Amino acid sequence: MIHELLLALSGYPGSIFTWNKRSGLQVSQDFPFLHPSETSVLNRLCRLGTDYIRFTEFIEQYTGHVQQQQGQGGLHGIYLRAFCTGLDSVLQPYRQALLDLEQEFLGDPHLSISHVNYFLDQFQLLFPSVMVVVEQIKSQKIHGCQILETVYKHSCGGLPPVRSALEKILAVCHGVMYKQLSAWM
Amino acid sequence: GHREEPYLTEAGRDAFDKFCRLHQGELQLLAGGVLQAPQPVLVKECELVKDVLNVLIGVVSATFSLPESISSLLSEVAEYGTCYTRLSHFSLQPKGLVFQAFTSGLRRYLQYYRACVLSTPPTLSLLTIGFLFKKLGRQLRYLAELCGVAFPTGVKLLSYLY
Amino acid sequence: PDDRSWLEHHVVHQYWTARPSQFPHSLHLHSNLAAVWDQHLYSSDPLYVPDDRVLVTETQVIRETLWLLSGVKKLFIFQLIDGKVTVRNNIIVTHLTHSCLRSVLEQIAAYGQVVFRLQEFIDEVMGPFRTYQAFMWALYKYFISFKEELAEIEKCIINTTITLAIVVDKLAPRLSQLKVLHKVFSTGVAETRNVVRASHLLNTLYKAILEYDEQTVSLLFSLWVETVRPYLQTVDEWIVHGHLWDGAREFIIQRTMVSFLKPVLKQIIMAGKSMQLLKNLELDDVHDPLLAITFELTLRSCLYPHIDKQYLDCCGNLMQTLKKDYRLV
């Protein structure tokens, strides 16, 4: 369960975390030695790995897969590509936290699961925020510069990690707009 | 004292392979023995570290051919090497003169890739190697879509890359 | 054998499953108390009443109590029937006669309901109001450090002598603190439009700090800052950018009354309306150093110069550019 949790959270589904698209990651939870206590902390942990899979799949799916083969600005185009480029760098402390957990496990493997949940609880509010940000762009066919407002009106929240996380991606999407302005004027 | 006898959820890498064996035993009972997977234990972490260190060279330990869940981890770092070799075979040829200059530029990028390995890791962990070569690996696989592995040569290349 | 032995020995598992538990002990009443009490009851001719309390050992009770006081759900001990967590009366240890146990687990279940209702409130925002959001964020910020304290105590069980009565006095400077938030939010849900439901909320903390103005006041004040965070952002935006913007009534001003900014509210409105008439021809970053250097009364009379001198500059500049170029005089 210790190395397997890291294997699942890295974005490679294990033999206990049954991969589905209607339940995401989910434990079997039918072992003849199951404890009632472990259930809730596992149900809390599965969601972040489920979100991480879709994020990495989105970024791979829509950035760096074409050589200029009508086109859409909420599936292709440079503003969505800038969104994905900012997106992957925002998920870097999630990776670095996963790298920090394994050193603690190598120091001693008898560590509490609530400690791991306590570590992941700061990403726990940020990830459901950015899911609706990608979902609105995908549903409403939001084209080009209208992406720039969409994150910007969603950065009027009051959670500090949401604001600080969105601002970098907004800076990249601003950078391409500055790049075209440097030529056109 | 008689030793409180801890939980199994706070134990793993010895309890993990045991519990995986139990899961496979329950599954092989529920199927009837028509599943039959080899090597339920092995490969470790550091041996796979040395193996993937050899994979980025362009050679294998004959694991591929043209715990056991780590293969689900391995494939995505495996499929990088399978395209990387497929560029060096596309540079095995010594053609147009602009095409020769193009292919020498591709070999000058392959030299960078060969230099990054054996110079950055003093045997780091597996997931660090995978994470560092995630943002770089898709960029290398992008160049396989760029290159041929007909493919244009001459003017039909010189306007295509332009 | 091979795998079932590694389970059977080293994993606890007997009592949270349907299985008779076997447990050796040192008999002779002082901790054999439950069996001696049952022997006396059967010797006094009950008649039968075949009580079935399966068994548990003592330390496992300690760790399940800590996981309940954390705020996570789904444990074997502590059944609940309507949303209020209560004792499971199916258990005996080797002592505690099933009546001392039924009382002490009831006392900690009373705090379990306190933490369970507030984590339910915290879950109902995690799956758009922008002051409730700041309030639940304040409670979340308290809760994460609280769960760190109990989680580090739980690691010291794997390694001193611990019982139930030790950990309740150990959590005393926090379980006293938890009872207050059960009272501040219950009046914040007891009470249509978002703005009256925000104003009666924000006035509650502002009143409740002055009520106790030792250590409880610092707790309430640390929640107060993280609840007043949106309002300061909006008053700064109304000052520097010269227009008020609401998410369909985000302020009591339309471009009943809160007592937090009332003694300078007049100085704020003449600040807004003067600046837009100036546009036709920062303050967070001075409030936050003020927290570095009677409490929430005269200290709030130190906030008011920051907006008052800024206002005098704005309205004086409007006056200066009206006495020349459309010169009234």
XYZ file of C-alpha atoms in Angstrom:
676
model
C 0.000 0.000 0.000
C 3.011 2.257 0.629
C 4.898 2.050 -2.668
C 1.619 1.344 -4.479
C 0.155 4.697 -3.440
C 3.126 6.465 -5.030
C 2.835 4.267 -8.124
C -0.843 5.256 -8.431
C -0.342 8.984 -7.713
C 2.461 9.209 -10.281
C -0.139 8.580 -13.003
C 0.298 4.854 -13.635
C -2.672 2.870 -12.265
C -1.809 -0.035 -9.993
C -3.268 -3.512 -9.617
C -5.343 -2.395 -6.614
C -6.510 0.985 -8.006
C -8.929 -0.130 -10.715
C -8.844 2.467 -13.482
C -12.272 3.630 -14.633
C -13.727 6.722 -16.294
C -16.881 6.744 -14.160
C -15.187 6.269 -10.775
C -11.622 7.384 -11.574
C -9.172 5.670 -9.271
C -10.880 3.388 -6.778
C -9.646 0.673 -4.443
C -11.180 -2.808 -4.632
C -12.141 -2.578 -0.901
C -13.294 -6.178 -0.596
C -10.250 -7.831 0.983
C -10.913 -10.367 3.782
C -8.669 -8.254 6.043
C -10.122 -4.818 5.259
C -10.081 -2.160 7.933
C -12.931 0.393 8.068
C -10.482 3.176 8.957
C -8.359 2.964 5.773
C -11.392 3.412 3.494
C -12.001 7.144 3.977
C -8.367 8.254 3.654
C -8.037 6.211 0.448
C -11.300 7.674 -0.922
C -9.853 11.108 -0.255
C -6.492 10.355 -1.872
C -7.763 8.864 -5.172
C -9.188 12.119 -6.584
C -5.892 13.991 -6.991
C -4.285 11.210 -9.024
C -7.454 11.025 -11.131
C -7.172 14.759 -11.883
C -3.421 14.510 -12.588
C -4.047 11.836 -15.251
C -6.510 14.067 -17.133
C -4.199 17.097 -16.853
C -1.179 15.286 -18.312
C -3.358 13.636 -20.981
C -4.774 17.053 -21.974
C -1.316 18.665 -22.211
C 0.126 15.766 -24.234
C -3.017 15.578 -26.389
C -3.067 19.212 -27.487
C 0.555 20.486 -27.347
C 3.277 19.135 -29.629
C 1.390 16.668 -31.807
C 0.865 18.597 -35.055
C 3.065 20.200 -37.689
C 0.307 22.462 -39.168
C -1.840 19.949 -41.106
C -11.478 24.680 -39.863
C -9.338 25.051 -36.751
C -10.743 25.834 -33.320
C -9.351 28.068 -30.586
C -10.554 25.949 -27.666
C -9.104 22.730 -29.035
C -6.071 24.062 -30.953
C -4.402 27.415 -31.521
C -1.658 29.217 -29.685
C -3.646 30.444 -26.669
C -4.638 26.916 -25.633
C -1.029 25.837 -26.202
C 0.159 28.650 -23.902
C -2.452 27.469 -21.382
C -0.999 23.938 -21.443
C 2.613 25.203 -21.222
C 1.732 27.146 -18.080
C -0.302 24.176 -16.807
C 2.565 21.674 -16.766
C 4.863 24.016 -14.834
C 2.142 24.707 -12.263
C 1.961 20.951 -11.509
C 5.703 20.817 -10.707
C 5.331 21.171 -6.871
C 2.907 18.211 -6.988
C 5.728 16.162 -8.527
C 8.279 17.562 -6.049
C 5.986 16.663 -3.138
C 5.699 13.105 -4.507
C 9.523 13.043 -4.625
C 9.622 14.258 -1.031
C 7.366 11.426 0.212
C 9.638 8.576 -0.956
C 12.637 9.835 1.039
C 10.523 9.772 4.209
C 9.399 6.245 3.344
C 13.018 5.130 2.789
C 14.005 6.602 6.156
C 11.324 4.446 7.820
C 8.354 2.672 6.168
C 6.168 2.764 9.304
C 4.579 6.154 8.680
C 0.943 7.097 9.188
C -1.411 7.435 6.226
C -2.924 10.597 7.758
C 0.523 12.194 7.392
C 0.353 11.571 3.630
C -3.190 12.968 3.477
C -1.988 15.999 5.473
C 0.786 16.501 2.917
C -1.583 16.312 -0.057
C -4.222 18.596 1.519
C -2.819 21.825 0.019
C -3.278 20.621 -3.580
C -6.692 19.288 -2.501
C -8.343 22.696 -2.935
C -6.423 23.812 -6.034
C -7.161 20.831 -8.309
C -11.031 21.068 -8.271
C -10.620 24.764 -9.065
C -8.644 24.199 -12.272
C -10.887 21.316 -13.436
C -13.804 23.678 -14.091
C -11.399 26.100 -15.804
C -10.441 23.473 -18.376
C -14.046 22.198 -18.596
C -15.644 25.574 -19.426
C -13.164 26.204 -22.263
C -13.799 22.724 -23.662
C -17.597 22.992 -23.492
C -18.228 26.555 -24.650
C -15.758 26.409 -27.619
C -13.979 29.487 -26.218
C -11.832 30.907 -29.010
C -8.528 32.745 -28.756
C -8.359 35.893 -26.629
C -11.565 34.927 -24.786
C -9.437 32.359 -22.939
C -7.548 35.281 -21.342
C -10.626 36.693 -19.614
C -11.922 33.264 -18.587
C -9.071 32.438 -16.229
C -8.835 36.127 -15.234
C -12.412 36.313 -13.983
C -11.772 33.054 -12.134
C -8.707 34.610 -10.443
C -11.017 36.938 -8.514
C -11.328 34.280 -5.819
C -10.081 34.444 -2.276
C -8.008 31.280 -2.012
C -4.282 32.229 -2.157
C -3.084 29.010 -3.935
C -5.689 29.408 -6.706
C -4.613 33.007 -7.435
C -0.877 32.266 -7.291
C -1.302 29.132 -9.417
C -3.393 30.745 -12.138
C -1.222 33.861 -12.524
C 1.741 32.022 -14.129
C -0.407 30.430 -16.852
C -2.041 33.806 -17.433
C 1.453 35.283 -17.834
C 2.317 32.801 -20.603
C -0.988 33.465 -22.408
C -0.184 37.172 -22.080
C 3.313 36.569 -23.463
C 2.060 35.249 -26.793
C -0.243 38.288 -27.144
C 2.763 40.513 -26.526
C 4.668 38.430 -29.108
C 2.159 39.170 -31.862
C 1.933 42.840 -30.844
C 5.714 43.179 -31.203
C 5.357 42.393 -34.927
C 2.012 43.908 -35.942
C 2.574 47.450 -34.647
C 5.439 -5.614 26.659
C 3.842 -7.870 24.042
C 4.139 -5.553 20.985
C 0.892 -3.830 19.738
C 1.305 -5.576 16.264
C 0.819 -2.701 13.740
C -1.507 -2.264 10.769
C -0.785 -3.494 7.282
C -1.561 -0.097 5.700
C 1.578 1.317 7.357
C 3.698 -1.437 5.760
C 4.886 -2.125 2.205
C 7.739 -3.293 -0.149
C 7.617 -6.530 1.836
C 3.895 -6.582 2.695
C 3.190 -5.139 -0.784
C 4.615 -8.126 -2.698
C 2.938 -10.485 -0.240
C -0.435 -8.755 -0.626
C -0.011 -8.693 -4.408
C 0.626 -12.461 -4.295
C -2.598 -12.854 -2.271
C -4.516 -10.739 -4.812
C -3.154 -12.868 -7.676
C -4.071 -16.040 -5.769
C -7.651 -14.872 -5.299
C -7.833 -13.908 -8.990
C -6.350 -17.225 -10.169
C -8.914 -19.045 -8.024
C -11.772 -16.970 -9.463
C -10.564 -17.609 -13.037
C -9.431 -21.238 -12.851
C -5.749 -20.795 -13.662
C -5.968 -19.459 -17.226
C -3.947 -16.301 -16.489
C -0.290 -17.257 -15.770
C 1.978 -14.183 -15.400
C 5.782 -14.499 -15.000
C 8.017 -12.734 -12.405
C 5.665 -11.478 -9.641
C 8.717 -10.192 -7.735
C 11.616 -8.478 -9.647
C 12.485 -6.046 -11.011
C 13.672 -3.822 -8.096
C 14.165 -0.049 -8.213
C 17.956 0.290 -8.645
C 18.331 -2.534 -11.199
C 15.657 -0.841 -13.307
C 17.560 2.420 -12.733
C 20.657 0.858 -14.303
C 18.526 -0.731 -17.043
C 16.822 2.527 -18.059
C 20.265 4.157 -17.870
C 21.279 1.585 -20.488
C 18.036 2.145 -22.446
C 18.777 5.849 -23.060
C 22.086 4.784 -24.641
C 20.293 2.908 -27.410
C 20.900 -0.656 -26.154
C 18.708 -3.034 -24.164
C 19.234 -5.948 -21.799
C 16.815 -7.947 -24.035
C 13.828 -7.113 -21.840
C 11.950 -5.573 -24.776
C 11.535 -7.054 -28.240
C 10.751 -5.249 -31.492
C 6.527 -6.245 -8.308
C 4.963 -6.448 -11.791
C 2.850 -3.284 -11.963
C 5.994 -1.255 -12.745
C 5.595 -2.292 -16.396
C 2.562 0.030 -16.320
C 5.103 2.621 -15.213
C 7.814 1.313 -17.549
C 6.019 1.493 -20.918
C 5.877 5.300 -21.124
C 9.635 5.528 -20.469
C 10.033 2.497 -22.721
C 8.253 4.037 -25.736
C 10.664 6.982 -25.614
C 13.639 4.716 -26.327
C 11.797 2.913 -29.129
C 11.497 6.157 -31.043
C 14.995 7.398 -30.133
C 16.675 4.399 -31.783
C 14.341 4.993 -34.742
C 16.026 8.370 -35.276
C 19.589 7.020 -35.200
C 18.628 4.467 -37.844
C 17.373 7.498 -39.810
C 20.893 8.932 -39.408
C 22.743 5.704 -40.306
C 23.076 6.974 -43.881
C 26.158 9.189 -44.561
C 21.009 12.361 -50.549
C 20.756 16.083 -51.075
C 23.424 18.449 -49.809
C 20.863 20.483 -47.863
C 19.493 17.083 -46.769
C 22.994 16.109 -45.583
C 23.254 19.367 -43.610
C 19.800 18.688 -42.129
C 20.769 15.161 -41.030
C 24.030 16.404 -39.501
C 21.945 18.845 -37.457
C 19.821 15.908 -36.273
C 22.996 14.070 -35.239
C 24.114 17.221 -33.399
C 20.886 17.014 -31.388
C 21.411 13.288 -30.738
C 24.827 14.186 -29.300
C 23.093 16.465 -26.767
C 20.725 13.655 -25.798
C 23.618 11.212 -25.430
C 25.489 13.779 -23.317
C 22.618 14.431 -20.869
C 22.601 10.770 -19.823
C 25.680 9.522 -17.863
C 26.408 13.121 -16.812
C 23.371 14.203 -14.804
C 22.492 11.088 -12.670
C 24.755 9.834 -9.907
C 22.115 7.031 -9.609
C 18.983 9.007 -8.673
C 15.578 7.426 -8.024
C 13.303 6.040 -10.763
C 10.479 8.583 -10.577
C 12.965 11.471 -10.706
C 14.392 10.042 -13.953
C 10.876 9.677 -15.339
C 9.796 13.176 -14.280
C 12.905 14.888 -15.666
C 12.480 13.021 -18.969
C 8.759 13.768 -19.195
C 8.987 17.339 -20.476
C 12.002 16.337 -22.621
C 10.692 13.002 -23.892
C 7.575 14.277 -25.640
C 9.760 16.938 -27.283
C 12.003 14.174 -28.646
C 9.008 12.115 -29.819
C 7.717 15.258 -31.562
C 10.838 15.151 -33.757
C 9.936 11.620 -34.878
C 6.721 13.080 -36.280
C 8.927 15.794 -37.785
C 11.377 13.387 -39.437
C 10.475 10.658 -41.904
C 10.988 7.791 -39.476
C 8.742 9.464 -48.577
C 10.341 12.369 -46.724
C 11.150 15.578 -48.676
C 14.650 16.304 -49.958
C 15.849 19.419 -51.749
C 13.473 22.292 -52.588
C 10.441 20.268 -51.442
C 12.233 20.050 -48.096
C 13.622 23.612 -48.148
C 10.125 25.109 -48.405
C 8.574 22.528 -46.066
C 10.924 23.269 -43.167
C 10.731 26.993 -43.971
C 0.371 -20.760 6.607
C 2.447 -18.584 4.258
C 0.356 -15.466 3.644
C -2.408 -16.125 6.189
C 0.242 -16.479 8.921
C 1.798 -13.085 8.067
C -1.724 -11.654 8.280
C -2.846 -13.511 11.470
C 0.285 -12.718 13.474
C 1.248 -9.187 12.576
C -2.044 -7.529 11.571
C -4.471 -6.940 14.463
C -7.562 -8.101 12.610
C -10.110 -9.823 14.854
C -12.488 -7.336 16.426
C -13.669 -5.165 13.499
C -14.808 -8.379 11.792
C -17.282 -11.037 12.891
C -14.923 -13.313 14.864
C -14.559 -14.229 18.563
C -11.434 -12.508 19.829
C -8.937 -14.290 22.060
C -6.690 -12.211 24.275
C -4.370 -13.358 27.080
C -4.113 -11.202 30.198
C -2.745 -11.298 33.718
C -6.029 -12.223 35.512
C -7.115 -11.321 39.111
C -9.646 -8.499 39.312
C -7.791 -5.112 39.026
C -7.809 -5.408 35.240
C -9.905 -8.614 34.954
C -12.780 -6.425 36.107
C -15.362 -7.144 33.401
C -15.190 -10.919 33.911
C -15.425 -10.598 37.716
C -18.430 -8.282 37.313
C -20.110 -10.794 34.976
C -19.375 -13.617 37.444
C -21.027 -11.612 40.234
C -24.030 -10.826 38.013
C -24.504 -14.483 37.065
C -23.989 -15.627 40.663
C -26.760 -13.229 41.704
C -29.154 -15.097 39.280
C -29.903 -12.642 36.427
C -31.607 -15.001 34.887
C -29.770 -15.635 31.664
C -29.624 -12.367 29.582
C -26.920 -13.701 27.203
C -24.906 -10.520 26.633
C -22.654 -10.630 23.552
C -19.886 -8.005 23.639
C -17.290 -9.440 21.320
C -14.033 -7.982 22.769
C -11.421 -5.274 22.055
C -8.055 -4.432 23.538
C -7.501 -0.957 24.946
C -4.977 0.823 22.705
C -7.012 0.318 19.521
C -9.762 2.328 21.216
C -7.248 5.174 21.673
C -6.317 5.303 17.995
C -9.926 5.126 16.711
C -10.822 7.958 19.099
C -7.978 10.038 17.667
C -9.150 9.379 14.096
C -12.662 10.458 15.022
C -11.424 13.638 16.744
C -9.457 14.355 13.559
C -12.585 14.635 11.439
C -12.375 11.567 9.210
C -15.366 9.227 9.117
C -16.044 5.491 8.665
C -14.653 3.761 11.772
C -15.886 0.541 13.385
C -16.382 1.898 16.901
C -18.791 4.926 17.065
C -22.018 4.111 15.204
C -24.246 7.047 14.217
C -27.983 7.017 13.525
C -29.059 10.482 12.345
C -25.811 12.337 11.718
C -24.817 12.571 15.379
C -21.990 10.231 16.342
C -22.725 8.061 19.399
C -21.267 5.087 21.279
C -21.308 1.587 19.850
C -22.586 -0.600 22.705
C -21.357 -3.908 21.354
C -17.919 -3.923 22.965
C -15.984 -4.622 26.179
C -12.278 -4.331 26.853
C -11.231 -6.437 29.888
C -12.508 -3.789 32.303
C -14.565 -0.546 32.373
C -17.753 -2.631 33.147
C -19.437 -1.373 29.881
C -20.786 1.619 31.838
C -17.633 3.687 32.337
C -16.827 2.879 28.698
C -20.312 3.970 27.576
C -19.829 7.313 29.355
C -16.284 8.180 28.273
C -16.901 7.284 24.614
C -20.058 9.432 24.833
C -18.039 12.385 26.115
C -15.562 12.190 23.238
C -18.402 11.542 20.760
C -19.810 14.895 21.901
C -16.685 16.545 20.459
C -16.860 14.189 17.489
C -20.205 15.716 16.514
C -18.620 19.192 16.808
C -15.860 18.293 14.358
C -18.180 16.239 12.098
C -20.707 19.020 11.486
C -17.948 21.523 10.698
C -16.231 19.149 8.276
C -19.649 18.663 6.663
C -19.882 22.454 6.275
C -16.342 22.454 4.877
C -17.287 19.690 2.418
C -20.337 21.585 1.157
C -18.021 24.296 -0.349
C -15.433 21.876 -1.864
C -18.097 19.979 -3.817
C -19.486 32.000 -5.471
C -20.421 33.856 -2.230
C -16.941 35.298 -1.462
C -17.381 35.956 2.264
C -18.646 32.539 3.347
C -15.713 31.218 1.341
C -13.302 33.247 3.483
C -15.028 32.018 6.682
C -14.739 28.316 5.798
C -11.157 28.979 4.686
C -10.426 30.342 8.176
C -11.873 27.190 9.757
C -9.867 25.017 7.299
C -6.694 26.892 8.254
C -7.325 26.142 11.934
C -8.180 22.513 11.192
C -5.042 21.563 9.224
C -2.666 22.493 12.080
C -5.052 20.821 14.559
C -4.898 17.566 12.570
C -1.091 17.914 12.500
C -1.005 17.938 16.320
C -3.131 14.818 16.680
C -1.291 13.079 13.815
C 2.085 13.601 15.478
C 0.676 12.275 18.766
C -0.488 9.152 16.873
C 3.087 8.445 15.715
C 4.238 8.301 19.352
C 1.875 5.339 19.879
C 3.848 3.165 17.428
C 6.986 3.687 19.543
C 5.852 6.191 27.313
C 2.531 5.012 28.752
C -0.665 6.288 27.113
C -4.310 5.855 28.044
C -7.588 7.623 27.250
C -7.463 10.017 30.229
C -3.975 11.144 29.194
C -4.843 12.135 25.627
C -7.972 14.062 26.628
C -5.950 16.278 29.004
C -3.277 16.424 26.299
C -5.831 17.806 23.824
C -7.306 20.141 26.488
C -5.813 23.428 25.082
C -7.459 22.577 21.715
C -10.733 20.877 22.660
C -11.527 24.002 24.663
C -10.742 25.956 21.498
C -12.952 23.733 19.298
C -16.091 24.456 21.341
C -16.092 28.139 20.364
C -16.345 27.493 16.618
C -19.363 25.287 17.280
C -21.021 28.437 18.660
C -19.826 31.038 16.132
C -21.001 29.064 13.081
C -24.279 27.822 14.605
C -25.333 31.466 14.910
C -23.954 31.939 11.382
C -26.399 29.366 9.998
C -29.393 30.266 12.202
C -29.698 33.742 10.524
C -32.429 35.333 1.063
C -29.986 37.823 -0.449
C -26.253 37.234 -0.119
C -25.500 40.665 1.343
C -27.597 40.471 4.527
C -26.319 36.900 5.019
C -22.791 38.313 4.751
C -23.322 41.376 6.971
C -24.884 39.527 9.911
C -22.030 37.038 9.569
C -19.265 39.658 9.582
C -20.784 41.523 12.531
C -20.721 38.345 14.659
C -16.909 38.027 14.757
C -16.490 41.797 15.214
C -18.808 41.648 18.226
C -17.385 38.393 19.605
C -13.787 39.617 19.821
C -14.815 42.631 21.919
C -16.791 40.333 24.248
C -13.670 38.582 25.553
C -11.272 41.512 25.064
C -5.882 35.205 27.388
C -5.594 32.715 24.515
C -9.154 32.464 23.182
C -9.084 36.075 21.919
C -6.085 35.330 19.672
C -7.987 32.386 18.166
C -11.057 34.507 17.361
C -8.875 37.311 15.985
C -6.968 34.895 13.735
C -10.312 33.815 12.311
C -11.404 37.477 12.029
C -8.539 38.483 9.729
C -9.251 35.665 7.266
C -12.943 36.589 7.319
C -12.409 40.335 6.746
C -9.993 39.753 3.807
C -12.587 40.282 0.963
C -14.013 43.524 2.361
C -10.609 45.239 2.596
C -9.878 44.274 -1.030
C -13.174 45.819 -2.117
C -12.693 49.092 -0.180
C -9.181 49.446 -1.640
C -10.571 48.787 -5.131
C -13.314 51.363 -4.543
C -10.681 53.919 -3.499
C -7.943 53.525 -6.108
C -9.982 52.613 -9.208
C -12.874 54.958 -8.445
C -15.751 52.569 -9.008
C -17.489 50.009 -6.843
C -17.947 46.599 -8.436
C -20.073 43.874 -6.882
C -20.862 40.303 -7.762
C -24.564 41.232 -7.610
C -24.558 42.843 -4.104
C -21.111 42.108 -2.621
C -21.234 45.218 -0.391
C -23.866 46.944 1.747
C -23.493 50.090 -0.398
C -25.643 50.380 -3.521
C -23.952 52.714 -5.995
C -28.555 47.277 6.827
C -25.342 48.682 8.307
C -22.197 47.033 9.680
C -20.489 48.467 12.759
C -16.982 47.470 11.637
C -16.513 50.397 9.222
C -19.443 52.572 10.385
C -17.492 55.425 12.148
C -15.738 56.146 8.825
C -18.410 54.872 6.370
C -19.330 58.457 5.469
C -15.656 59.059 4.639
C -15.699 56.078 2.300
C -18.747 56.944 0.183
C -17.604 60.508 -0.490
C -14.334 58.792 -1.515
C -15.969 56.714 -4.241
C -18.232 59.318 -5.769
C -15.454 61.910 -5.776
C -13.051 59.696 -7.695
C -15.308 58.865 -10.661
C -16.001 62.596 -11.114
C -12.197 62.900 -11.042
C -11.755 60.182 -13.670
C -13.856 62.156 -16.167
C -11.327 65.021 -16.382
C -1.842 50.126 -1.867
C -4.193 50.394 1.107
C -3.989 46.645 1.730
C -0.217 47.193 1.684
C -0.532 49.747 4.509
C -3.121 47.804 6.524
C -0.882 44.735 6.541
C 2.123 46.577 8.091
C -0.310 47.953 10.700
C -0.832 44.422 12.051
C 2.940 44.203 12.598
C 3.212 47.177 14.969
C -9.115 48.540 23.219
C -7.873 45.895 20.772
C -9.976 46.158 17.573
C -11.185 49.513 18.907
C -8.285 51.968 19.140
C -6.092 49.835 16.893
C -8.890 50.201 14.332
C -8.673 53.942 14.950
C -5.136 53.552 13.541
C -6.485 52.106 10.283
C -8.700 55.136 9.647
C -5.820 57.700 9.019
C -4.677 55.597 6.023
C -8.003 56.026 4.201
C -8.651 59.525 5.611
C -5.476 61.245 4.341
C -5.858 59.460 0.978
C -9.431 60.741 0.765
C -8.373 64.299 1.628
C -5.883 64.163 -1.245
C -8.492 62.851 -3.722
C -11.260 65.334 -2.885
C -8.772 68.203 -2.677
C -7.436 67.386 -6.140
C -11.004 67.377 -7.497
C -11.547 70.753 -5.813
C -8.302 72.102 -7.318
C -9.211 71.017 -10.835
C -12.704 72.473 -10.486
C -11.550 75.930 -9.352
C -9.532 76.175 -12.584
C -10.898 75.106 -16.014
C -14.708 75.275 -15.434
C -13.745 77.661 -12.623
C -16.695 78.004 -10.213
C -15.357 81.108 -8.463
